[PDB]
Design a binder for this molecule. Sequence first.
Ligand SMILES: [K+]
Ligand SMILES: [K+]
Ligand SMILES: [Zn+2]
Ligand SMILES: [Zn+2]
Ligand SMILES: [Zn+2]
Ligand SMILES: [Zn+2]
Lengths: 179, 173, 179, 173
Amino acid sequence: TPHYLVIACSDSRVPAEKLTGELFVHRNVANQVIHTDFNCLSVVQYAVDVLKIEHIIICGHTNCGGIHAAMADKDLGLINNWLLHIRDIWFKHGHLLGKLSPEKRADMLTKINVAEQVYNLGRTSIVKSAWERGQKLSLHGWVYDVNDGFLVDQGVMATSRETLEISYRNAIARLSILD
Amino acid sequence: PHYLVIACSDSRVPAEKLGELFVHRNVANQVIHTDFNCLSVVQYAVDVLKIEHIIICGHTNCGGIHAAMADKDLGLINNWLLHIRDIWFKHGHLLGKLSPEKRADMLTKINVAEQVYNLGRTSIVKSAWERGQKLSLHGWVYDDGFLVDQGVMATSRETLEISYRNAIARLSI
Amino acid sequence: TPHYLVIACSDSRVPAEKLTGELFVHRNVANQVIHTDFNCLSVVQYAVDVLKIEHIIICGHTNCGGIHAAMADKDLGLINNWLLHIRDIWFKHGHLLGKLSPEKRADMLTKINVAEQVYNLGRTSIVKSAWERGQKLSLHGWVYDVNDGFLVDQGVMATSRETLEISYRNAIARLSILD
Amino acid sequence: PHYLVIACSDSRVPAEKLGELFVHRNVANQVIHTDFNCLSVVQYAVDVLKIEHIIICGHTNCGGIHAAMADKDLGLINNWLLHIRDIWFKHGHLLGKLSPEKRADMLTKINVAEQVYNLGRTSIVKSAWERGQKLSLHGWVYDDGFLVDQGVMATSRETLEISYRNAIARLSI
Ligand SMILES: [K+]
Ligand SMILES: [K+]
Ligand SMILES: [Zn+2]
Ligand SMILES: [Zn+2]
Ligand SMILES: [Zn+2]
Ligand SMILES: [Zn+2]
């Protein structure tokens, strides 16, 4: 019986265990929590309401094929519809990303992505219901760097809807301060 | 990467236990015909990453299977698991003539076979077989660390039918 | 504020109103209730839990492009995945349908389809929850004949899970008695 | 048939009010990028039935829009309507500078524009524009029986961008 749900990207070198029998795991292209995705939501509702899990962790990673492909203007087929949610996030932060050296943008979008997905997670009926009946539950947004094996917590962390707004809002403001 | 592995979200089932792995994990290692998430994964691997093997790995003592068999109002996940209840019914006569102790194990294996059968019927895999692309599909069940069942193994629509029928027939012994 | 939810096929001459401001309406290819379909389920959960609707009616129709296409062994693309649920139903009743003049099979599969979809509907958490807290709710399976404007109730009718099993089971037995 | 119409499941919105119609209806007339149901409808119409027009029809005084704006624990449908809350936020500055009485109406129109914009970005429609197939997309809003807004109208990816920007700019007056 596990204490953590990890949501991670299907990309190659990213395994939740390796990275960090205690893990319940979902893996999809670019570690997405899409609001109407039955697959991910069912993982989340089973973990929260059934296995009484208390931590959900969304882990993106640098050099993500999903992120790269979402940014390439390319006719790949079905997957392009999956990644339109990433393109929507890109444009929601277009000013920010535009201001950046083109070869740095992927890494930034990976980071932004993680914050957006936590924000989505935090607004599911599953998570709000659970928070609202006093169930203890915390959400985390991490980015793991394949270049140097180092995790990089993103200080998106939420234990309530109010804290969700605050850390989401701050994480975006921190990312907009450009080195 | 060279393999796409589709495995259960359940706790002890890491794809790696067996850098070349693209992974999807969902409750009860399902390929639902109309699941945009899993299908996306399948299309990207087959059409873009050029993966030549897709492996559906189930496991013994699986909470998805157990919950699918229990009458219980669990909420959303129940809807996800209705596809496994349909599979229980499809093989209801086989599973009936069996000790209530060991039904989960059987349905765990049958489930794997049915997901490969579904996988091999996606437009994605069919039309890649049809344009000469090399692509094989596998159905494993895992425990003591070992693989218990291979069963279904397909390289073409033709071999899909045969491996599926034969896999079910071996289980009905 | 409507009293009926109708689920019908997107095919051309089939409009719920015309056929029979009181209707909430969902239309998809071959009038499907797929267990993991967020779109249809959301219609159903809003109707039942929010608008307090008391009748849900699934209407198929003869000469259905969806049904025909599901039976043709044909490379149409994405839609083929949608219609694999119809092909599954076909094979669940293969003995029955096989025993039939090939040009009658479409019409029979349309009928069978309606029963299967009601059975799916009747097993949603939404509908079982509602029945189980004593909410009044009835499910209907109809086939409308385009050839002669006549509806044709299929005597799938359920007001409870026990009645669901019985009418589903009977509707299939009636259809297996071949004229 | 020659038109695919995508309209709201809500009560007074029959496609026919305006034999040539293929219809889809869902809460708040949405085209969600990853909605297998609506996308199937779109792919079948475009690739198989050869429909040359797709029309997204929204309506005034729409329960989907109202519920999306209300803070209310409605259950599953809330998840469906999160995509409209994202659209509220995307145009939050426009909708803020507006009387709380008339926000629903505005967001009803903006919603229509965003769904056409999504429709025009599906692989299905893009790749049919790219192989020379004639296909136009429309965004209507309906009430007294009349159509209130046309706004977005697209025949190519190029015309998609222009019609979408301009439609939003006309609404920000
Ligand atoms: K899905
Ligand atoms: K869906
Ligand atoms: Zn990745
Ligand atoms: Zn499992
Ligand atoms: Zn039809
Ligand atoms: Zn509406």
